[PDB]
Amino acid sequence: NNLEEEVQKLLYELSEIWHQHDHEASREALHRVLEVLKQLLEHNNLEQAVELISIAVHVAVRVNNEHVIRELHHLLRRLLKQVKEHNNNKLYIAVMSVIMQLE
């Protein structure tokens, strides 16, 4: 399945950036993930958006990319709205935990 495979690759890329403190790789990877998150939200792929935004938050905080942090605040706003409208209690708590880690 092309979408799951690609999300899994994006998660791996960001995970390796986080473990290696790879500041050089991070800016390109974070901008890409920001665009993927917006698509995922548009197509109501909320499970995958939650797993990707969590590792995106970890990386953005670790490398202190203040622009991406600001963008992630907005995407978290939208994601929380969308998980609440779909009444998904497990996703709600996951998004809250990410919000608490970004803050």
Numbering used by the authors: 1 to 103
Question: Can you list sentences taken from the study reporting this PDB entry?
Answer:
Because of the therapeutic importance of the target, and receptor extracellular Ig domains more generally, we next sought to evaluate the generality of our approach by designing 5HCS based binders to CTLA-4. CTLA-4 plays an important role in peripheral tolerance and the prevention of autoimmune disease by inhibition of T cell activation. Deep sequencing of a site saturation mutagenesis library of the most enriched binder, 5HCS_CTLA4_0, showed that the designed core and interfacial residues of the binder were highly conserved, suggesting the design folds and binds target as in the computational model. We determined co-crystal structures of 5HCS_CTLA4_1 with CTLA-4 and unbound crystal structures of 5HCS_CTLA4_2. The unbound crystal structure of 5HCS_CTLA4_2 aligns with the structure of binder in 5HCS_CTLA4_1 bound structure well with a rmsd. of 0.416 Å. The circular dichroism spectra indicates a helical structure with peaks at 208 nm and 222 nm consistent with the design model and was unchanged by heating to 95 °C, indicating high thermal stability.
We reasoned that to enable systematic design of binders to convex protein target sites it would be necessary to generate scaffold sets with overall concave shapes. We focused on 5 helix bundle scaffolds with three helices forming the concave interface and two helices providing structural support. The selected 7476 scaffolds, which we refer to as 5HCS (5 helix concave scaffolds) throughout the remainder of the text, have a wide range of curvatures. Our method for computationally designing small but concave proteins to bind to convex protein target sites expands the space of the protein surfaces that can be targeted by de novo protein design.
